[PDB]
Design a protein around this nucleic acid. Structure first.
Ligand SMILES: [Zn+2]
Lengths: 176, 49, 117, 76, 141, 94
RNA sequence: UGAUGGAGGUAGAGCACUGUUUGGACUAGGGGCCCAUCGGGUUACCGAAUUCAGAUAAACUCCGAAUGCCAUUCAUUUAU
RNA sequence: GCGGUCGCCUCCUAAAAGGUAACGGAGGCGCCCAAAGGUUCCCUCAGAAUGGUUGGAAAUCAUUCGAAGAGUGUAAAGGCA
RNA sequence: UGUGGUGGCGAUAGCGAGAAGGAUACACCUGUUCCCAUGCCGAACACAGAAGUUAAGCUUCUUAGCGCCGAUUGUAGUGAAGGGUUUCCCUUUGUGAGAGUAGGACGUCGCCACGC
């Protein structure tokens, strides 16, 4: 892709210069994207889960899981075994291409351009971004009729805020 | 609910075994490959009608 | 992200296999060890802890690539060095592994060359 | 008018064999309910967690490191 | 009849105890304290009386330490009920004191008000007393 | 420099009941160049050091030779007594 | 009787767990009353997260005694 | 006499082998499961902190700490990572 | 002697913190057509590989901060023998714990292989 060759050519050695790694094996990388859609309303209607799986299968290349319940609470009106959410793991080359799509397409479909929200800090290279909405090219008005969103959990091998910021920054992520 | 039940050798026709079922979970008649004493051979046993 | 190093789980599965029966007085173990490049084998009693016969993958005589190719050769050489000492009823260690290659070749080549299972 | 005073019966646990006995085949050694002592050489566990004596010999008790203990038989 | 120091039960009844002997358990917080020299139960209300006879010589507060608290319960039958059936109703909250748990502690006040306060405290408890400082203390930080 | 330096026996059994009456303080020492002995004391020689020299100052046990530099560790009595029991000396050197 | 081996949770300690509980420090933010009608949140319990010293228990245990108890091709004495 | 109780199972009383009564102190039982059984493989929990769209202290997520603070069809002991 | 595999001995073997190494070896590491696999996912599991590196793991060494093992004392309790009030305490003879430690402790022993 674009980004692997960016690693092999330009992204790595400047980050090596900023911190003086005695081995190239200490280049921090990008592993995962976890995508989640908690619903809550699908307990009332089993037809709510009919569409989110379709949307996530269109945005990703995978059918997501159908997540369990882990609890039994009537104050949140849940038994065990309740189908609530949907996980998408992402590895390999679809990682980089989905981040390419996030750079080129998603972020210029945001109302009220102010920048990517910084404060996902967490110390240990774990930036998550809530997504509220039609921010994707594989989506119709006449198909999507709900106000569902998305979830991004990118987990790295970095150890600071700063190295994680520069991993996300040399690859994109236009923060505020 | 749960009733005592006796099995039946489907060849030599003797009431060989005895067990228990829950007849709202399992309204049918069971089929297990149990043993037969009179024949010395594995035989598909079923519920006595 | 922590990545648990793979010998830990291999030794956990060993300890959850070895605790049934070693029984190695006259029916000793076999032993099977992966790497990224080679294969090792030992035949041990208890509680002397002595290997009575052994053979590497590619430290004595090679055949080809570090494959099932080698595994058949090691399964030859272990039993060929073994039955000279008079061993008949050896017991497998599964290691911590499963059976989709590189181990069952050792098993079958241990079967034909004189070791009963 | 009390709503108490009802009992189990004494089911008579505890060791029924010393150290250094001369023990025949199959006799009980230490009757449990719950694994308080694991078996060792030539001793098995019953359905109700008792302990046997397979080979004729001598009962001796040991450790398993720090936590729990063993029973084993050594013949002549 | 109001109890100064109730508990949270876990159990309505307990056995009637059996107290023999203790020792040690020196003055820790304050500077002036009693020592029980005997062995009895001590009920709730005696500690109220000890509080009030402590404080009504104390002026503008001072320092009051209570180091003994009721835990256990009594029962009693009615009047005229025969021997026979189950235990009586739980009434009161009592805790025994052996030879030498320090009853209370005082500090921040010179000795004379302190010894008056401890004499007033000791004449409302059924146990003989003494008066103790941090007398022989190698541990004083 | 000078104290009640004495010695004792292994198990002086329940005669110690009489040691509670006629006024003796049984004491304990264990340290570096001498392993462990018990030593007699009387109460009229250490509380004077507690008042005069202090509660945590240097005690030099002397065997008419080299020094033994002990310190108090614990001495907690039975109550309603006002007399010493369980004096554990403890030597830390120069 | 003596020697040797183990079965075990009693007396006392009884803090580590589960119950009951005494005073201090700390805030993380509950702080009702705030200054308020834009940042300082003022007092109080500082309760939970803690963190100090200090108690305690038939149905609490990190530990743990004398004695009896079961056995020994063991020794002595005695008569079952 | 009126009341209460009559068989079985756990714990304390029970004096550290076993046994041991009182109209002493406490809780259950007269079932259930065709897999909640047998074998063979694989796996490790409750919580706590920190961010994350509807999201609320507490649904679904991600990271770290964590010998158990969980679970074990059913009452209690004893067990079981 | 190193390095790997594999055994017992109560963590005195541990935890935490600090340093060095890549001969051979182990592992990370490049992939997935093949045997296989994912309740989705070459992360694992399984199969192919020799581009790169001691960065982590692994191995050696340092530390008594944490956890562990801890003598001799004394004291509480107790068999036997007694004595006064019998709620309870005291005295002879035998046996003695827990807390508190001075101290020990950053392993010991076994087999095989490959280099040295
Ligand atoms: Zn038949």
């Amino acid at each position: 892709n674009r980004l692997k060759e960016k690693y092999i050519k330009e992204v790595t050695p400047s980050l090596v210069e900023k911190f003086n790694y005695s081995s190239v094996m200490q280049t921090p990388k990008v592993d995962k994207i976890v995508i989640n859609m908690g619903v809550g309303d699908a307990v009332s209607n089993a037809k709510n889960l009919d569409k989110a799986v379709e949307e996530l299968a269109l945005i990703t290349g995978q059918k997501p899981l159908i997540t369990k319940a882990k609890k039994s609470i009537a104050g949140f009106r849940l038994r065990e075994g309740m189908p609530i959410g949907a996980k998408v793991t992402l590895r390999g080359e679809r990682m980089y291409e989905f981040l390419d799509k996030l750079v080129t397409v998603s972020l210029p479909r945001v109302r009220d351009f102010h920048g990517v929200s910084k404060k996902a800090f967490d110390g240990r290279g774990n930036y998550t971004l809530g997504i509220k909405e039609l921010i994707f090219p594989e989506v119709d008005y006449d198909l999507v009729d709900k106000v569902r969103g998305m979830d991004i959990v990118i987990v790295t091998t970095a150890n600071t805020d700063e190295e994680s910021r520069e991993l996300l920054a040399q690859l994109g992520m236009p923060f505020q | 609910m749960r009733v005592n039940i006796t099995l039946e050798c489907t060849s030599c026709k003797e009431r060989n075994y005895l067990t228990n079922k829950n007849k709202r979970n399992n309204p049918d008649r069971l089929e297990k490959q149990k043993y037969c004493p009179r024949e010395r051979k594995v035989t598909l046993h079923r519920e006595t009608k | 992200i922590t990545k648990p190093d793979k010998n830990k789980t291999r030794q956990k599965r060993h300890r959850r296999v070895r605790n049934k029966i070693s029984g190695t007085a006259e029916c000793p173990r076999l032993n099977i060890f992966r790497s990224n490049k080679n294969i090792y084998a030992q035949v041990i009693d208890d509680v002397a802890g002595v290997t009575l016969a052994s053979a590497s993958a590619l430290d004595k005589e090679i055949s080809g690539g570090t494959k099932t190719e080698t595994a058949a050769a090691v399964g030859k050489l272990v039993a060929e060095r073994a039955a000279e000492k008079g061993i008949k009823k050896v017991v497998f260690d599964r290691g911590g592994y499963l059976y989709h290659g590189r181990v069952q070749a050792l098993a079958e080549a241990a079967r034909e060359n004189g070791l009963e299972f | 008018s009390t709503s108490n005073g009802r009992d189990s019966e004494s089911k008579r646990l505890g060791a029924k064999s010393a150290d250094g006995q001369t023990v025949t085949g199959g006799s009980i050694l230490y009757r449990q309910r719950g694994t308080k002592i694991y078996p060792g050489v030539n001793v098995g566990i019953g359905g109700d967690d008792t302990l046997f004596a397979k080979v004729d010999g001598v009962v001796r008790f040991e450790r398993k490191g720090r936590d729990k203990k063993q029973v084993s038989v050594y013949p002549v | 009849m109001l109890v100064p120091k109730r508990v949270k039960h876990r159990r309505e009844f307990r056995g009637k105890m059996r107290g023999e002997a203790k020792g040690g358990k020196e003055v820790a917080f304050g500077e002036w304290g009693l020592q029980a020299t005997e062995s009895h139960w001590i009920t709730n209300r005696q500690i109220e009386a000890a509080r009030i006879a402590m404080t009504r010589y104390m002026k503008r507060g001072g320092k009051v330490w209570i180091k003994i608290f009721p835990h256990k319960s009594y029962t009693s039958k009615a009047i005229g009920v025969r021997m026979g059936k189950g235990k009586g109703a739980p009434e009161g909250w009592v805790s025994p004191v052996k030879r030498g748990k320090i009853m209370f502690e005082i500090a921040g006040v010179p000795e004379e008000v302190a010894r008056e306060a401890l004499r007033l405290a000791s004449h409302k408890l059924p146990v003989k007393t003494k008066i103790v400082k941090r007398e022989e203390m190698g541990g004083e930080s | 420099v000078q104290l009640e330096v004495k010695e004792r026996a292994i198990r002086p059994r329940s005669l110690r009941n009489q040691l509670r009456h006629e006024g003796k303080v049984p004491a304990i020492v264990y340290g570096y160049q001498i392993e462990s002995t018990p030593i007699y004391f009387e109460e009229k020689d250490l509380s004077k050091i507690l008042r005069e020299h202090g509660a945590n100052t240097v005690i030099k046990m002397t065997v008419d030779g080299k020094n033994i530099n002990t310190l108090m560790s614990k001495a907690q009595l039975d109550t309603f007594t006002g007399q010493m029991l369980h004096v554990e000396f403890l030597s830390v050197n120069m």
